[PDB]
């Protein structure tokens, strides 16, 4: 027997909001709810992570262009744990996308409809601008959290790094959050670890975009766009399409069932 006072804890699924956006979803109320979750979540994630990167980039310079593992770990924690917290907070509000590339994968998977998806992506972009301006104002010194190529990487290598890192993130969302099972509630944790490793892959070489809202906001705030800024848009878009493609193949194959 479950006592009545325990029942909500046992019966109420901790499921992404988009799983329950059916008929009735096109109200102004419901669009505002989704937008508010994406705004709050994206702001808190990116603001946190930008300040952490600002601090980490005050570490003494490493000679000869070498890497600084502790620095890279710190920045990776700021984005990976930051997104973890943001998605846990907003999971039942908006689904915690916090990333236009994530929303695009979800639109392709027909988890989120296109108009709602556009509203969410524009909200994420505005939140990233706001986060960049707030982190800039709140920290001494010049902005140190904008994306740039490093570590000898070319534009072409950077594009592929960005695309594969984004694919890992998006495939995690699809398999854990979109698919419906007893680990869906835990997806925010796995999404955070995916982003953590994508930052360990990419910071040194690309600064780790993985998220057009993350790359755009600091560029506006610093009034500085490298000519290669397009990699931070195309790379994540290609990663979203790659992840979708793999998910769609497995859905076509009815992966979860031995004997369909």
């Amino acid at each position: 027997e479950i006592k009545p006072e325990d029942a909500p804890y046992i019966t109420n699924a901790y499921k992404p909001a988009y799983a329950r956006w059916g008929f009735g979803s096109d109200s102004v109320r419901n669009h505002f709810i989704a937008m508010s979750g994406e705004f709050v979540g994206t702001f808190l994630f990116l603001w946190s992570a930008f300040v952490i990167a600002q601090i980490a980039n005050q570490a003494p310079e490493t000679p000869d262009g070498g890497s600084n593992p502790a620095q890279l770990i710190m920045i990776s924690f700021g984005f990976g744990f930051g997104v973890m917290v943001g998605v846990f907070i907003t999971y039942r509000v908006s689904g915690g996308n916090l990333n236009p590339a994530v929303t695009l994968a979800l639109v392709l998977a027909r988890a989120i409809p296109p108009f709602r998806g556009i509203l969410m992506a524009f909200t994420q972009i505005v939140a990233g601008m706001a986060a960049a301006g707030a982190a800039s104002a709140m920290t001494p010194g010049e902005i140190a959290f904008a994306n740039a190529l490093g570590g000898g990487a070319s534009r072409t290598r950077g594009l592929f790094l960005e695309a594969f890192g984004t694919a890992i993130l998006c495939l995690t969302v699809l398999m854990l959050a979109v698919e419906k099972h007893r680990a869906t509630w835990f997806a925010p944790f796995v999404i955070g670890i995916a982003l953590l490793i994508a930052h360990l892959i990419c910071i040194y070489y690309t600064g780790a975009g993985l998220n057009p809202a993350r790359s755009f906001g600091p560029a506006v705030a610093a009034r500085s766009f490298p000519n290669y800024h397009w990699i931070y848009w195309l790379g994540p878009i290609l990663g979203a399409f790659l992840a979708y493609s793999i998910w769609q193949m497995w859905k076509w194959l009815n992966y979860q069932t031995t004997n369909p």
Copy 2:
């Protein structure tokens, strides 16, 4: 079928104590239970974290005021994992607030009544004093775990850093621990990660208060109050109010339901 010997493991919700404080709660017994949980939890959390900070601050000095990412990670682990353990231990005792700013958010949300909340906040303060005195006595050298501004931050920047970091913590409590669902049991983990990232944001600039009991106790023990000590009270109070405000908006909107 569930075997009888397994039933408690399956049916007994691991829910914060305050969720079940209704009629009968105003007994001396029940107030003592709540106070004892907050005392034990806050002591063990802050004592642990103060000793860890003491050790981390014995690292060789970084030139030119630069940051030391490994040092910052270590201190962040001491507070973030420390609070994680403290809240898991005391979740069903007192609810594991361990922070007057957390209790204030819970009072505003009507999760905890005001008198009980005052008792809990005074207990947390006394525990923080005790923890500071014990960490001082048990470690060689001068106290190295008091809060101070650094990294070029002004008082005004420090106030806002403190407020936003505290907001992140408090919004995590509200959405995961107060809201009733299948992830409420896991809230202590997410609360610890929230505190971890708030320390990665704040240590370098403010020393990371985020908790008036954490800032006050070392100040008493070192017999030293900077004139800006008020930021460590007002900042977290403002963060608690911000987090409450966002939660209250979502409750007003019935966020969890598509068609109310």
Copy 3:
């Protein structure tokens, strides 16, 4: 009561694929599903981890052959968190073995049949080749992610380090993923931590193979096989047999039941 829209989240077990490979499993469809999961999972895990190791190995050299704890932690995170993500993504596809030594333990335990197991191990090997070639092409500089003895270890010490580290990994798989209980869904997390600690044990001394597909692929890509390369095959094979042996003893004893 569980609402119908919540039911899948509550009822659908997040269980490894091999748990449900009975009659009907020998179709071409089902073999392709298993192979695709192992390919995708092993590629994403090893590619990620190889790039992270490449970066970590750009850290300034430590004098006198000493260790660099932050470097070792970074590499350990790349493999341990990398495998965590890979197994969570592929758990219901292929079971997320990602390691021929893991598949061998599962074959010995009769969790996976021999022919399917061979298909999975050959797929993992090809994925490791592909991952090594892609990480090589995508990063500047020479390959820095191949296995080699270091830290003064002899071949014989390295063989035993490899064997015991692999045993820890394989025993975790057996007790958490093969055994059927309320923590089976969480096995991917524990498997990742097991691999993390096995890397903290082995990187300094052997480079941390723990996985013949991980050791072979970089060796092909660098066109370089040390004469001691056999330790990276025999060590993990012996660890798989050790882990199996302990599991089998406990199964023979009916460990989970007081009164059989």
Copy 4:
């Protein structure tokens, strides 16, 4: 509806073995099962952690006696994650105590009977000896994983550090693993984090004993007992008694119930 093939995953509690040691438990079979779990678990935990400490202690020396945060984090990960893995593997075998101080707390709480408890503690001691000898033989150089006072700590400070760190560990076991609820399955994770923070507290000052089997085995292997070795026995024993005392007070108060 739960499908029959999913039922074991949903119904079989992942509960410590000692929870089900009632009538029938005094067979030779059952004592051997408990001993084998403690042997395997304690060996794998301590062997892992000793090798990791050996490596971490090859880091370049820090001037002036200062601390090395990355080194301390690495050693803390080896013990905290090591114990996590060991307890998850052995939870349903022996309950995963892996520490005579833990077993003593459980005996005081009447979770484990005294004779069984003595068998388990002697097994842990022998496993720690075996682990120390194996880590010694498998690594080049002198043993670097024995406990010693450092960081300016006196014997008396070290005794109290050891006692409080052990209390944190033991109180976590009692509240999460002994108490029966929906988070009992997760206790191994929390136990690992508790041990992680206890190492961040103690390594610098005492070497972090926290476990008489951990302190004794290296001392035998190095043929070296400091005259203060008793702190590594009395400290953890006092911590076990402290944790018991707090748990017992809360049990006496019926902490989990508002209106008994």
